[PDB]
Design a protein around this ligand. Sequence first.
Ligand SMILES: OC[C@H]1O[C@H](O[C@H]2[C@H](O)[C@@H](O)[C@@H](O[C@H]3[C@H](O)[C@@H](O)[C@@H](O[C@H]4[C@H](O)[C@@H](O)[C@@H](O[C@H]5[C@H](O)[C@@H](O)[C@@H](O[C@H]6[C@H](O)[C@@H](O)[C@@H](O[C@H]7[C@H](O)[C@@H](O)[C@H](O)O[C@@H]7CO)O[C@@H]6CO)O[C@@H]5CO)O[C@@H]4CO)O[C@@H]3CO)O[C@@H]2CO)[C@H](O)[C@@H](O)[C@@H]1O
Ligand SMILES: OC[C@H]1O[C@H](O[C@H]2[C@H](O)[C@@H](O)[C@@H](O[C@H]3[C@H](O)[C@@H](O)[C@@H](O[C@H]4[C@H](O)[C@@H](O)[C@H](O)O[C@@H]4CO)O[C@@H]3CO)O[C@@H]2CO)[C@H](O)[C@@H](O)[C@@H]1O
Ligand SMILES: OC[C@H]1O[C@H](O[C@H]2[C@H](O)[C@@H](O)[C@@H](O[C@H]3[C@H](O)[C@@H](O)[C@@H](O[C@H]4[C@H](O)[C@@H](O)[C@H](O)O[C@@H]4CO)O[C@@H]3CO)O[C@@H]2CO)[C@H](O)[C@@H](O)[C@@H]1O
Ligand SMILES: OC[C@H]1O[C@H](O[C@H]2[C@H](O)[C@@H](O)[C@@H](O)O[C@@H]2CO)[C@H](O)[C@@H](O)[C@@H]1O
Ligand code: GLC
Ligand code: CA
Ligand code: CA
Ligand code: CA
Length: 686
Amino acid sequence: APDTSVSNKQNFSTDVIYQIFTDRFSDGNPANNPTGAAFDGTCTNLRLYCGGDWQGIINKINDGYLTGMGVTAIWISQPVENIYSIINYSGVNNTAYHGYWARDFKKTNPAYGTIADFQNLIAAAHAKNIKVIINFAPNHTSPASSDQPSFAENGRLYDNGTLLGGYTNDTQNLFHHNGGTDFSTTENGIYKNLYDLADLNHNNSTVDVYLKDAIKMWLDLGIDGIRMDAVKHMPFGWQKSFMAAVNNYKPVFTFGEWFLGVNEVSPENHKFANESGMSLLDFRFAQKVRQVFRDNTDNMYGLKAMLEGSAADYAQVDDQVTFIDNHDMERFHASNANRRKLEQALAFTLTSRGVPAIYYGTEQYMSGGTDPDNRARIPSFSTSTTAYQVIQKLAPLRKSNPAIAYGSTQERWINNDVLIYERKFGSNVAVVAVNRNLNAPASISGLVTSLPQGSYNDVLGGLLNGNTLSVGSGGAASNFTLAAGGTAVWQYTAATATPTIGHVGPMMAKPGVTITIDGRGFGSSKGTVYFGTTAVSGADITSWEDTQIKVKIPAVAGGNYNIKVANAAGTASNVYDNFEVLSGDQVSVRFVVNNATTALGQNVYLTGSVSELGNWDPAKAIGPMYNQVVYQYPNWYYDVSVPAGKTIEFKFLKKQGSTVTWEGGSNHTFTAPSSGTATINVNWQP
Ligand SMILES: OC[C@H]1O[C@H](O[C@H]2[C@H](O)[C@@H](O)[C@@H](O[C@H]3[C@H](O)[C@@H](O)[C@@H](O[C@H]4[C@H](O)[C@@H](O)[C@@H](O[C@H]5[C@H](O)[C@@H](O)[C@@H](O[C@H]6[C@H](O)[C@@H](O)[C@@H](O[C@H]7[C@H](O)[C@@H](O)[C@H](O)O[C@@H]7CO)O[C@@H]6CO)O[C@@H]5CO)O[C@@H]4CO)O[C@@H]3CO)O[C@@H]2CO)[C@H](O)[C@@H](O)[C@@H]1O
Ligand SMILES: OC[C@H]1O[C@H](O[C@H]2[C@H](O)[C@@H](O)[C@@H](O[C@H]3[C@H](O)[C@@H](O)[C@@H](O[C@H]4[C@H](O)[C@@H](O)[C@H](O)O[C@@H]4CO)O[C@@H]3CO)O[C@@H]2CO)[C@H](O)[C@@H](O)[C@@H]1O
Ligand SMILES: OC[C@H]1O[C@H](O[C@H]2[C@H](O)[C@@H](O)[C@@H](O[C@H]3[C@H](O)[C@@H](O)[C@@H](O[C@H]4[C@H](O)[C@@H](O)[C@H](O)O[C@@H]4CO)O[C@@H]3CO)O[C@@H]2CO)[C@H](O)[C@@H](O)[C@@H]1O
Ligand SMILES: OC[C@H]1O[C@H](O[C@H]2[C@H](O)[C@@H](O)[C@@H](O)O[C@@H]2CO)[C@H](O)[C@@H](O)[C@@H]1O
Ligand SMILES: OC[C@H]1O[C@H](O)[C@H](O)[C@@H](O)[C@@H]1O
Ligand SMILES: [Ca+2]
Ligand SMILES: [Ca+2]
Ligand SMILES: [Ca+2]
């Protein structure tokens, strides 16, 4: 099957996602509507259930609203059963309409539908070439008070109906009891509660095994991707072991939500996306887009800086999920704002690198402040809005032109208000011109592109005042006027003679697992696949065609490898780096080191005899470790994904910058569990 097929669960770069807040999209089955005080059929009280469900999504899939827009993927509110409590927060009733208050990860939220409804949704979507992503929030259960068990459902967690435990009398330690986070430090935000939500303890074997079993159930139901909620708030090492569980079973595109504020560029965020096994919602992209197109707090130079910086900071920038707003931000379109601002932000996002995700209702020009005002019921299903047509014209390009899906990004013209950028992949090219200045045209002369000589029509057909482009020899464009608020898209596609890799997924798994290599120019005859210097050919290459290769990871030592392919004739492709071969199945183990004193700025790290611990290379040591919440300095701790059942030797390090101080004595040793978790507690050896 081609890289663009709906069956490709490992690659969403050729897709356009539609963010569906289930309860607020379409009530297709009034019969499963919550009743009484938990419901408001008029959807005036945005904190109660309005009725939106999966039958409704099925209907909008079948009547062409989404397909007519060029939408090829959707993500939905967490599907698992939530508490049924109607909580009164300072005079106002609140319900789990948002799906974030889980009580049973192995059952569905009856308000959204039954398991059968979910199966029907998966089927209906796939029949229309639409992939389905589910929100999954393993960080917590629901609102709770240990001193007041009668409050809500006490954060109780059930396993397919069987009560496991609640926040009160939590002798099993299924949850954390360290108060609420103030977001002062990453560690603080991980081992303390978000709001009053019962924080799950992933170091508890029951919890660990339970959540991994739960996600497998959903994987078996046919989901095509996972949107991990609040990933900045769970142990990064545990999440890696989680992604390993997913990838070593049935790999599907996964990304997490890690909020970044305006002007916030986070190295931790980059590292998580680069090493966790999942990508992230591109807040850095979203926030800059809002600054430039919405709030006028930066110009095109800032937009360019964001594009160049992110392409360098993210190992797989093409896996980051882009957007201009979502369920937590104020809607991009302000009540009194010119609609062209939203339309340009949309065109920009749809033609930029990554995986575009449009928040439901954006195309209907919905406005609204922060939660819950940004979650109003979609006002209409009109295909006649300009925004709807913008998506309709550009969304399909991610499928037809690989430059948009996998291409590099290069600025070709720029000033305060204008940015003309080029996407390029193999012989494919796309040039996008945007003039955010709604009052002043711009004279574009000296524009040089990779477009072959000829005349190119604006793919938007002048919808956003774009124009035709005339390209001479050398790719030099003839002088033209870019209209005020003008947005144009010119593109070119052609066969690629040389094997070219545009995407690989998953990027982390153990030997034997099948990975998907997408691109162009692979040829129809099986060639060769390389993991580092190791060559794979023949039977282990399950299938091979021009745009997609399915190949089993060879049994090489755990580590980071460069992926490359060669066609049947032996012509080698470009290198797709940063592929992590795991040493085997993974388990999350907590390492605790006692009496490791340090100077301010100096931190303790973990190193060991397996790639998962960096194979003794300090530059790849695990950490910086923590020393405040669960354990206190001079004791440090960290949760780490390590190969199950392996006997591992390790040591701790104290690092100040790249300067390293090693534990003295012999290596520490332990054997990781075959499943579940474990805690290894040792003393720092001088
Ligand atoms: O020994 C003493 C005492 O200890 C224990 O009590 C402590 C608690 O255990 C501990 O958690 C802590 O709780 C306090 C909080 O730290 C503090 O912040 C405060 O919480 C308030 C909050 O300030 C209020 O704003 C209000 O919260 C609202 C939100 O503002 C709304 O936006 C809404 O939210 C929900 C969203 O609508 C949902 O979409 C979803 O959000 C998700 C996002 O959409 C998603 O993008 C993101 O990634 O993840 C989010 C989560 O999935 O969920 C949101 C949360 O439900 O609604 C909430 C609810 O109104 O109210 C909270 C609660 O009052 O106050 C807390 C109480 O003090 O500190 C406690 C005391 O130290 C023991 O439990 C106790 O018995 C002991 O006596
Ligand atoms: O955002 C939170 C901060 O995180 C990081 O801080 C870590 C330090 O870099 C790391 O050295 C360690 O800090 C411990 C000190 O090493 C240790 O000496 C002692 O600190 C003493 C200090 O020496 C003394 O002068 C002062 O009077 O009392 C301190 C004790 O409170 O304990 C420190 C831990 O409590 O761990 C830190 C994380 O907990 C970032 O480096 C920092 O920039 C961030 O602000
Ligand atoms: O692959 C090559 C070798 O790999 C493994 O060796 C690793 C060790 O097992 C591991 O402990 C670590 O070694 C560090 C020491 O633990 C640490 O004490 C220090 O050693 C210093 C020593 O303190 C000092 O007295 C002496 O003068 O210099 C030593 C350094 O030369 O740093 C060590 C790291 O350099 O990392 C080793 C891999 O680098 C296998 O165990 C080994 O058999 C392989 O040959
Ligand atoms: O002609 C090559 C040149 O094109 C672009 O330069 C623009 C510049 O961005 C505009 O602001 C204005 O100064 O016109 C120039 C072309 O004459 C590229 O930005 C530049 O890198 C490239 O060399
Ligand atoms: O600062 C709070 C928020 O205000 C507005 O919604 C901006 O568009 C957004 O970028 C910012 O994060
Ligand atoms: Ca309903
Ligand atoms: Ca947590
Ligand atoms: Ca890369």
